[model samples]
Target chain A: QLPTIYAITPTYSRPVQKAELTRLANTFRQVAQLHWILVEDAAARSELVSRFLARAGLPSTHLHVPTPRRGLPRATEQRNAGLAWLRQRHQHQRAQPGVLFFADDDNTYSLELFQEMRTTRKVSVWPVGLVGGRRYERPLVENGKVVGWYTGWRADRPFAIDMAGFAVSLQVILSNPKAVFKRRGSQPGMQESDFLKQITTVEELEPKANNCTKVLVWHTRTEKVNLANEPKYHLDTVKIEV
Target chain B: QLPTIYAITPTYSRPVQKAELTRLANTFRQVAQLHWILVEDAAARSELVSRFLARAGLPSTHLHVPTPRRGLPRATEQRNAGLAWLRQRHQHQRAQPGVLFFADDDNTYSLELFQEMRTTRKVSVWPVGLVGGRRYERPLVENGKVVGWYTGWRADRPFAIDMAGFAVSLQVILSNPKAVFKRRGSQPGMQESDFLKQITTVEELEPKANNCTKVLVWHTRTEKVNLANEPKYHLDTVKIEV
Candidate 1:
């Protein structure tokens, strides 16, 4: 059985993209039958992302669609791009992967995180580290069950949620192919919340790590380097050629 | 240079007053020039707590304050009592100790979390694990400066936060000693946001861990054990002694 995993990495031309992609690439290499989808946050791929994907050296598909409108509205765009790719692959052939994972560039992917993904039933939710202004943000688990979510900062957000908390099955993603992400959803952080709410009901959510009891990965954000000469390092050592 | 640390602990006496007290006692053992205040969420104390305090082997004051009736206000009463304690003690002192921290029982603390407390100039914050509906909650930092908090789930709250995300300087806390926590101030999990709005401004906010560039202390929450035969917990029973 081909465990086709589509790793959706969203990148901007910012200096941190190189190191961010490097970590993600290293993580992507650990998986079998993976496709690293690099979605740049602009109309054209910058030298940074293009070369980073090439360096990753994995069997990957590169698709560049400029970020929509005047916001960081590409999270869903990127996912949509991946979903389209999967749909295309399936339409041309009867092959669809067993699992789908949204791998953000700045996230720290643990080996065990993937282990949890292998058994996604409809929608699987787990704990993410360094999110929601706490060491870890997770779905509330009670006795090996996902009771709710534990977001601190945006509990009341229109669509209150940090984006990097959970993963859905390929079937669920494809089931809602037209279910693109919307910024105008319930609230700001609700971008993720609305996405999850639309996709799964409380009953459909399967808890991993014991209802998010243990953290499998950290949404470990890469601090944007803002030093005077930080860009010089990016240009010289880590710069990519799009 | 006395370190004026304030410990705030929440307790309900169903089946775990002893567990909560043990954790609270452990927290009290690690402070300098500290005032330990315990607010039971009820009108009466569990014999376990009363006995534990008798032999708690720590210097502290105990108040068995029940939350307001009718509404049965939540943690607000407990926070208010702690603030009142600060006002009474610092009423005479021209300046109070450097820090005020709100700690919850059933959470873990590291000595390093206290060391990080020393550097709090205004309102210092870090990350908490398994909170706010994510694996970890943290601040977004840049250039050794705190840019903002990273709680995505509660983007709309006045100040999105977990109870354990920060340790404010006493100057900030006492400046508004009349600053009381209100259950009606926000929905559940929004007390931190409400509390920060009362104490500080957003721009006046300084990012610790350089905008949470590093993961220091984890808001590690203990697993909520559920008995198959019985839930053994109740929100109202949290106030009533076992």
Candidate 2:
């Protein structure tokens, strides 16, 4: 038997919002026992996302709440809301084995990456391609153990990692209930490091994808759609969903 | 009951190469009776992609041949290579009912689009988002009949459409075996037009995706990854397959 992978994704509406969701849904559906928790950054739930989830057929949960009027990191509130649901589910629902992964909307993921993170005992670290102003950012592994950091960002942090570089075990999250993404003292791009500090230590960190050598995920952002000439054709007769 | 979708994709090596193919593999696996014909724009077949296809869990055929010169109107030779495979399968093996779609690696596709075009009796046309410098480019349809065009560039041409705009029926392809992509007299961005003229005309074009109103596919390109800091860490210890 395998643990259920609860993929936490923070999404917002945009020109290619549905397009991004469609590709993600396609990828997640190919996996086994993957439950997608898609939390939107909006006041109410979106019909665009709602209709998408309805037809997506992936094991998923839909939630929505706007980010507060504060200067914090983006997707912080939505991710926290996902944890809230998980904590609540852990209290009531079947406490089945599970793992949590932060799957962003525009990022690229391999099916192998999702399967590799299911066995994470605490927080398993790996390399994320096209991240941190470098070809990749990774947790340096030695003798089947994590030794140091190999990131383009601040390598001095406890865990110099990208948001896409790690997956946390559900038992670890349940053990440390207050371990969530911090807001105030977290430095720029230090959200991953700060949040990781609450539950696990550097030595306790596990490495996946063959001791963090292979990069199975990419932080690939989509290009801005050039719709300047959209004014040339007006098809308002039928409201088309992208 | 369902016609097979021969999804012809042209791929190359880049930082995000595996990422793009992963999404495509994930999407295509969800589809029923899909035969992916992925042709690499390389001298030999890629072991990275070959290893990927082995575990992709979808039925596929792999081919390779390097494109000679033109960088702008790219993927012509790779697509021609895909057609040759399809034609050879039609000639030697049982010619199952199928439709040919040039599934580019960079574009975003909806699952519904695959099913929508499967019943294509002839060449089927649809709207592609973020194509031809507009929100979408499509065949102007009235009463479920394609009459005119709503493209941004050269609407006066025979078929002013992107490579992601159409899908051809297998029977039509077998009937016109000599009709391959023209590189000699084909204008810039007119390769799709030149290929279409050999098999079908605009009046006989079949429109899909709710009369070509919704944009089921997108020509959304991936943003170039900024990898300026890769010289920071050089770990040539183990060859990784990313």
Candidate 3:
């Protein structure tokens, strides 16, 4: 069987929430052997998501866990939930050959990237375009091994990389049962390095996309919609799911 | 030679502006014979845009025209600026076989949609996903002619469609030089109709994407970034182009 690729996403409710999910689903639908794990940071899963996922027709799982008072940051809680789900499903040698990628809903992804990360053993790394205040941020790979880091932001970190730039192996997580994200003393950009350190070392990192030269994923951000010109109150004529 | 696709984008200076453009450039770079026109709604264009476009390595034009005191609405001046550039370049059968599409910098686009509108004669229309307070908004076609509109918004308008839903033929614009977008008595949702009414009617609309059944583009908005948790002061440690 072709090894599966599990795409875990952390989504929050907003005006563009549904729209963002719809676009991500459109791209994911084209790829083969992809199982999407959508974890929402909400008190309860809304019907909007329930309906969207059903119509999306992709092999998907919907889960939700709200943000805690503190100690964890960024998408920490949601990502932990995803890892918990994965560990529970593949507890024994029942653990299949699958790679894990944290796909943020708004980022741009090419179908080619998914296939490239499919053969990951421990953890595969690549350059992410439009990140770290640079055109791209990547692992400085030397002789098929990750030697150093190349990033515009805080290059001094242990693993100076973007969340969208790497894929973790499912078996790696299964083996290291204690491997999960911790936000106790974390900064905004440290979540990736924080989580990655629990699984593998820099020397053991597998670099892909032609030694981090090609950028198959971009850390693109969407601009807030300009609704200032429109009326504050709704027309109340149409019931939109927006 | 293949017909060119002129994708006109209206942009304003914001935090995610450059990031948004980079992603758009990545997608546009994949298509062939595509000439991207990046217009800025500022008094003058920034070096950021200048450098960004040069590095983009695609056939492109960087233009700047600030928003007027009033009258025009929603990327109106920038689109007109793009139209003016098109008219000036294509003035004499100097007009090449090409198509015109108003591509907002922040929308999600599929590569297939560009080819689908490649042979557009007058104006080609398609279903735009995540728009009009619904899953999608499209021109309802009956026997290859636009009979009505399927939208959750104001369907009573002559053209109840999003900006991303249609493409205009270059020849159509050149032939009808007076078809520039107007600002007189225009509402928020009326810009598409205002510009569209000058050249083609509902009966003359060409439906693409298997008669408007597929969504090649999505009107997905990006949520505002939550930077409240971070320190208000910059580290000044790294000069990021973000």
Candidate 4:
């Protein structure tokens, strides 16, 4: 049983904002002892996320951090805010969290992800579909330890992972109080990998239920759905979609 | 002017071992002060690798380890041998290497990868290609700092990185005198990530040679050459000659 699992999400005003938010809310609604930390990436409020959060009805906290522009890998800014909150709240109460997970609105979260969270000693990782050029990409596990990647995917990025690939323990988040996502001037995949590297070491580590052989999670990216009725986010005069 | 950097490769008896090894050697030949640590993934020696190692003529140490009959990640056994050798040699030496890199054989090693290695600090990282779903994957870098991953791969394993994504400094390696690649059963991708976590945290990390935004390394995999006429592990039953 997990003490308390906080799933932090970084949401933005997307074409499927309602659908994405609703799907996420539905997923979280099914689990107990779960706190949804939703940070909207906007200068102002969007009723879509607020409404969804209210409906999720789980213990939740809402924050808004505006992005000057919609950039590639834009989720880092809002995610950082949620991480900051997780760190601060845990500081107030010594009773830390059982798991701290990063869940994006567009991806599909397997039920096993929750089951695996229990094994997250510090940070937990899993295979995601549509990622790494293959059906599933993951770390190699031997004798209950993480070794390296199995899929022939990106080989230069540190940690070589995406945000949806992992769940972290609150103890790690609490220990590294200053850890947060970088958004100002960011490299391609550095935000997710570097932020995680801050909390846990690659050695003497613990993996989730999988021993690197099974691809429990698929890096399912949300198809860029085009809703005729929905309009995408516009920065000044420019519109950003996909 | 940069300090001399060593490019170490751990290889094995692959299907197209000769071609793969030659391509790697060619990549290494481009740079000076680059040494190849070609550790064969096998129990016994092969004239093929020996000839290639000799022909390549890069300052290299060709070692062999009985490849494990069963291991998902592959190369774990061989890497341990290389690491052990490094530790033993550095036992009494006051001056050790400035940088140490692990470059896999199958993947394409770009000149930029070597150039970037020249600037690696105690532990330096950059972007990898064809990995984690994105065209180029890497840690989120801001003003030369690692923040997070910018790709699509995810996992519950520890490190969540592809093999060639990161490079470490000899100083960090020397500092952790007792550190060695343990046969820790990990979920895929976690092996390398687990190794990074054991020795360093992201906060103590540095982004090398600029943000390394361009894709310096490609997760180029070797094509599986099927030879119906060839016998397994022996040249006597050669059905087709290369």
Candidate 5:
């Protein structure tokens, strides 16, 4: 049987939430042997989202946990919640063999990327396009083995890679009970570095996507919407729709 | 050569516009032979829209013409503009063989839908999921031929179909040079009926999407964002960020 690929996605309520999820669901439906775990950053899971999940027709689970505060990054906590779910399921048994990947709601993923990570025995790495103020952030591999990193910003950081650049094997995740993603207070952009340090060393990484030369995923950010002329918000008021 | 598919899209400036377009472009890139004609409903083409089009890396043309008023639907005029562009391109030549599909930016399309419509002889019709207050609205077919319609509302109206339910062949479009979409002033949902009436009769329409039994496209509308609780707007009325 094809190994299951457990995809962890953290999403919050936004104007583009449904659109993004519908698009992702369309892609996910095409993938085989996949399980989607959607974590909602909300007080409670709304019917609006739950209906979308049921209708998406994928092997999926939905859970909700609110962020400490709004406007802060909720992906870390939401992702940890997904990990905790998996941990609890495997509490008395050996962890099932599967590939685990943290998928952000806004990023672009090629179907090939998921296929590349499906057979991962340990952490597998790849190049991510349009990230970190550069065209791509890739692992510099030497002699078919990952030797170093290439990222535009904060290369001095521990992982020095975008969240889209890697996938973890279920065994690594199962073995590391304390490996939870948490914001290091003032240190922003360190979630990947922090989470990765908990599970595996850099030398144990498996290189994929043509030895890390090809970009199969992208760190694309949705643009901020500006509806200055819309009347629903500012018909008689002074101004601005944020 | 494979027949080209001219995808006409009407987009406006919104926070989700680029994100939606990017997602659509990712799908469009997989198509074999296609051209995207994006018409912006703005006074003039803004740099934001222009840059996104340029970087989308599709064979696309960008044009802008604002809607006459703020409250009116812009889709009709925007679609007419795309037709005008196509007409201008084949001015002195034999009208090219192609397929014309009105692709709204917010709608979801399966890649197979494009392939199904590519060989349209005249006007081709299919099933649109999640539209017209029903599970699906489709072209009723009997004996592998389109016979009538299956819609939830206004079935007595000419066509009685959602915008995503059909595609016109280039020959039909070119033969009826003046065929364009417009409101009947008081009749709100007659754009498809009026425009289609000019091109072909109901019997001439070719049925697709597994002979009109399957839905290959969806009339999905993105929800309007409710940002009432956003800090950027209400609490700091004294300070503004736009």
Candidate 6:
């Protein structure tokens, strides 16, 4: 049997939430042996999202745990919630051999990415497209080993990487019980570095996607909807006929 | 009130059909004034497709009218079925002002493409990316008018454009009742040309998508799934534990 990929996505309620999840769901449906763990940044899961997941046709787990406060580093608390759930599963006998991937909802993932990362050992890394104000951000390799990183912004940070750059073995998470995301004093765009440093060292990372040269996931942010001039409150107020 | 875009798509059964349609459905949900018309290449609409459209949450019409045989020019009879439906609506008093777009289920479309072509006066043309073994194929504009085409192959053909190139005004289709796709003696890539020649003249075409310089839609073909080496029939047959 092929190894399973445990994909954990930290999402919040927004105008594009359903659309982005729908897009991701379509991509996920194409993947095999994928267990989606959708963690919502809310006190309780909404029916809208519940109904969406039911129809998504993927075997998934939906949970909600709001952040301690607003304006916190994005997805930090929600990701921690997912980690806690996995930790609980690890404590039980039903634990499965899988790789954990922090798949943000807005990013674009190629189908081959899941296939490549499903057999990951320790921490596997790859290139991320359209991140850090550059065409791409990736791990630089030398002699078949990841030596450094190629990024346009703040490369001096301990582990300069986008959220979509890597995946971890589920054993790594279960072993490091206290490894969680922090936001009190971490630099902007350093959430990945903080969380990653807790689990594995940079030298031990496994490079995937053609030794981190090819971009398999793109940090594609949707453009903000501009309807300031419209008289209605919601954007869908206008009557449209066909 | 915004103008409605009557987007017509012709589809058939395939492994990637639902995946492609789901991607297109997510894009359609973001648009404010779109009425989708999905035409299936079957004698009758199958339950699988009908159920999918119902859950897509877009205001749409499901139709089915099969071609006489397979291995013909793509989407010929299915697109004509959509066009015939539009013509029938035009014959009734409930005809509304809108634009007609031949949206292929497999292509990648930017939301701005619909907005740019919604107000087409006659037939607006634009650039299509990754088609005919070229980076892009587009309408060659001179002095703000579409004078020629920039395709990699068959430039001497009548229309010489990708299926994602242009959209016709509703009035243009209502006037040209007999405009439809043909394949008896048409060239391999002349499907767009044959149907376009009936509803519009070259001199009257309007250039869009930043004066036909930007590629807003891509004629992207999905990669075929390879399960020949796998021990199971479906990709998800591998035993996965959670």
- The prediction achieving the highest TM-score against the true structure is 2
Rank ordering of all candidates by lDDT, starting from the highest: 2, 3, 6, 5, 4, 1
Query: Which runs in model 3 stand beyond 4 Å of their true positions?
Result: A1-101, A108-178, A181-194, A200-242, B69-72, B152-154, B186-188, B229-234
Best-to-worst order by TM-score is: 2, 3, 5, 6, 4, 1
What is the per-residue lDDT of model 5 for residues A194-221, given as tens digits with 9 covering 90 to 100?
8888887788888998888776676555
Candidate topping DockQ: 2
Candidate 2 is graded, for docking, as medium
Candidate 2 lDDT, B188-237, residue by residue in tens: 78888889999998888999988998888987678888877766446545
Number of the top lDDT candidate: 2
Q: Write the per-residue lDDT of candidate 1 for residues A1-242, one digit (tens) a residue.
A: 65666666666665344544544565567567767777766777666566556756687877766655653445667667766776666653554446666777765555556667777767777776555554455666566665555555665533333555566777777677766567765344556767777787766777776556665565544333333322322232111121
What's model 5's TM-score?
Answer: 0.61
Provide the overall lDDT of each model, using Cα atoms, as 2-decimal numbers: 0.60, 0.85, 0.79, 0.63, 0.75, 0.75
lDDT tens digits, residues A144-192, model 2? 8888887667889898899998999888888888878876654677888
**Candidate 2 interface RMSD after superposing interface residues:** 1.7
Instruction: Work out the TM-score per prediction.
Output: 0.46, 0.93, 0.66, 0.47, 0.61, 0.54
Q: Give the docking tier of candidate 3.
A: incorrect
Q: List the residue pairs that clash in candidate 6.
A: none
DockQ of 6: 0.04
If ranked by DockQ, best first, what sequence of candidates would result? 2, 3, 5, 6, 1, 4
What's the lDDT of the predicted structure labeled candidate 1? 0.60
Chain B structural similarity (TM-score) per candidate: 0.81, 0.94, 0.94, 0.86, 0.91, 0.91
Alpha-carbon interface RMSD of model 6?
Answer: 15.6
Each candidate's DockQ = 0.02, 0.67, 0.15, 0.01, 0.07, 0.04
Candidate 3 residue B223 Cα shift, in angstroms, is: 1.9
